[PDB]
Design an enzyme around this catalytic site. Structure first.
Site, PDB file in Angstrom:
ATOM      1  CG  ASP A   1       9.336   7.765  -1.278  1.00  0.00           C
ATOM      2  OD1 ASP A   1      10.050   8.019  -0.279  1.00  0.00           O
ATOM      3  OD2 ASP A   1       8.214   7.239  -1.181  1.00  0.00           O
TER       4      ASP A   1
ATOM      5  CD  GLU B   1      -2.576  -1.329   2.603  1.00  0.00           C
ATOM      6  OE1 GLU B   1      -1.857  -1.518   3.607  1.00  0.00           O
ATOM      7  OE2 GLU B   1      -3.825  -1.279   2.655  1.00  0.00           O
TER       8      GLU B   1
ATOM      9  CB  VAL C   1       1.247  -2.860  -4.808  1.00  0.00           C
ATOM     10  CG1 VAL C   1       1.892  -3.513  -6.034  1.00  0.00           C
ATOM     11  CG2 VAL C   1       1.741  -1.427  -4.625  1.00  0.00           C
TER      12      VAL C   1
HETATM   13  N1  LIG Z   1       6.581  -4.978  -9.324  1.00  0.00           N
HETATM   14  C1  LIG Z   1       6.490  -5.213  -8.067  1.00  0.00           C
HETATM   15  N2  LIG Z   1       6.663  -6.437  -7.582  1.00  0.00           N
HETATM   16  C2  LIG Z   1       6.544  -6.468  -6.254  1.00  0.00           C
HETATM   17  N3  LIG Z   1       6.725  -7.671  -5.619  1.00  0.00           N
HETATM   18  C3  LIG Z   1       6.691  -7.959  -4.280  1.00  0.00           C
HETATM   19  C4  LIG Z   1       6.859  -6.977  -3.231  1.00  0.00           C
HETATM   20  C5  LIG Z   1       6.836  -7.362  -1.868  1.00  0.00           C
HETATM   21  C6  LIG Z   1       6.649  -8.737  -1.506  1.00  0.00           C
HETATM   22  C7  LIG Z   1       6.627  -9.176  -0.083  1.00  0.00           C
HETATM   23  O1  LIG Z   1       6.785  -8.267   0.985  1.00  0.00           O
HETATM   24  O2  LIG Z   1       6.454 -10.494   0.192  1.00  0.00           O
HETATM   25  C8  LIG Z   1       6.480  -9.711  -2.545  1.00  0.00           C
HETATM   26  C9  LIG Z   1       6.501  -9.330  -3.903  1.00  0.00           C
HETATM   27  S1  LIG Z   1       6.184  -4.932  -5.520  1.00  0.00           S
HETATM   28  C10 LIG Z   1       6.230  -4.254  -7.094  1.00  0.00           C
HETATM   29  C11 LIG Z   1       6.018  -2.798  -7.354  1.00  0.00           C
HETATM   30  O3  LIG Z   1       6.064  -2.366  -8.633  1.00  0.00           O
HETATM   31  C12 LIG Z   1       5.786  -1.794  -6.273  1.00  0.00           C
HETATM   32  C13 LIG Z   1       6.587  -1.788  -5.070  1.00  0.00           C
HETATM   33  C14 LIG Z   1       6.371  -0.820  -4.048  1.00  0.00           C
HETATM   34  C15 LIG Z   1       5.359   0.143  -4.229  1.00  0.00           C
HETATM   35  N4  LIG Z   1       4.603   0.132  -5.386  1.00  0.00           N
HETATM   36  C16 LIG Z   1       4.783  -0.797  -6.404  1.00  0.00           C
END
Ligand SMILES: Nc1nc(Nc2ccc(C(=O)O)cc2)sc1C(=O)c1cccnc1
Length: 294
Positions: free
Chosen positions: A123, A12, A18
């Protein structure tokens, strides 16, 4: 969403939520970001539409941009874990230095690329850096203060993190430069090394004074023009600079030297992503693979 069978909510961000989702049609797994209102401006949809062309191995690929009903949807390639979770997962043992080095090196390449194309992230934080099983790390989010501008929070009552904010921003400089990203990356680098946030401020002033307590209250000598900054007050307490060897032990001198250059108060003195890639610290850089528990 009609075209996507949302798997789960994986975040979020400071602009929206997301989700992990599968394209019911292509079967591809993607990261779907729901953006935040009363019509959704067009100057931004362009700024965003511009990001799709910003492709680099260390930048999360923005696949599709979909504007519809006060809500903007950004479809990104999905990466399995973010640096915040990986650091938490590596807390007891620490991330091995060669991996820390590889990650820093790759993010600097990502930034050099972004910056050479006049794109600023603004950021950077562990949650916005994504990693895969192959040893790569990519810049994600990029915020959008220019294509919008951080209001008062994320979007729905959530405490924004100030920990990686450059001092010129905290002091009210309205015109950020690429230097703010180097500062943020410097803070993350330190955190990977020590396993503790470098400047964990819980308010703008606390953030500023935590920086001052560690790097010394800046003055016209180290930062020409600082006393003219919008939020600078003559009444700021005057703290002496702490010895860098106490800031990030047990980082070696090459690493400490690079870190000091990434953390220079004066944005104009702060090292560029391009120059940082040439620092001696990266002489023996490699690309180890992380041990990811998914
Ligand atoms: N492409 C993409 N893939 C993500 N994967 C995970 C991120 C976290 C986790 C986890 O904490 O397990 C798993 C997969 S986050 C993300 C974003 O493009 C993104 C990141 C932050 C804010 N807005 C967009």
């Amino acid at each position: 969403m009609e075209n996507f069978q949302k798997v789960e909510k994986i975040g979020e961000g400071t602009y929206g939520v997301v989700y992990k989702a599968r394209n019911k049609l292509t079967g591809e797994v993607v990261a779907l970001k729901k953006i935040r209102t009363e019509g959704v401006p067009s100057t931004a949809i362009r700024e965003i539409s511009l990001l799709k062309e910003l492709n680099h191995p260390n930048i999360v690929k923005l696949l599709d941009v979909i504007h519809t009903e006060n809500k903007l949807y950004l479809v990104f390639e999905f990466l399995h874990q973010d640096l915040k979770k990986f650091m938490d997962a590596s807390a007891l043992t620490g991330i091995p230095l060669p991996l820390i080095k590889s990650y820093l090196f790759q993010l600097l390449q990502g930034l050099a690329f972004c910056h050479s194309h006049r794109v600023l992230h603004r950021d950077l934080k562990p949650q916005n850096l994504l990693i895969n099983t192959e040893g790569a790390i990519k810049l994600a989010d990029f915020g959008l203060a220019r294509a919008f501008g951080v209001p008062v929070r994320t979007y729905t009552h959530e405490v924004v993190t100030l920990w990686y904010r450059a001092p010129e921003i905290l002091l009210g400089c309205k015109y950020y430069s690429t230097a703010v990203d180097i500062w943020s990356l410097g803070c993350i680098f330190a955190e990977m090394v020590t396993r503790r946030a470098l400047f964990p401020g819980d308010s703008e002033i606390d953030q500023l004074f935590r920086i001052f307590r560690t790097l010394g209250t800046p003055d016209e000598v180290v930062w020409p023009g600082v006393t003219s900054m919008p939020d600078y007050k003559p009444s700021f307490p005057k703290w002496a600079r702490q010895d860098f060897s106490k800031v990030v032990p047990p980082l070696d001198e090459d690493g400490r030297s690079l870190l000091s250059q990434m953390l220079h108060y004066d944005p104009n003195k702060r090292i560029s992503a391009k120059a940082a890639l040439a620092h001696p610290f990266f002489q023996d850089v490699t690309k180890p693979v992380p041990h990811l528990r998914l």
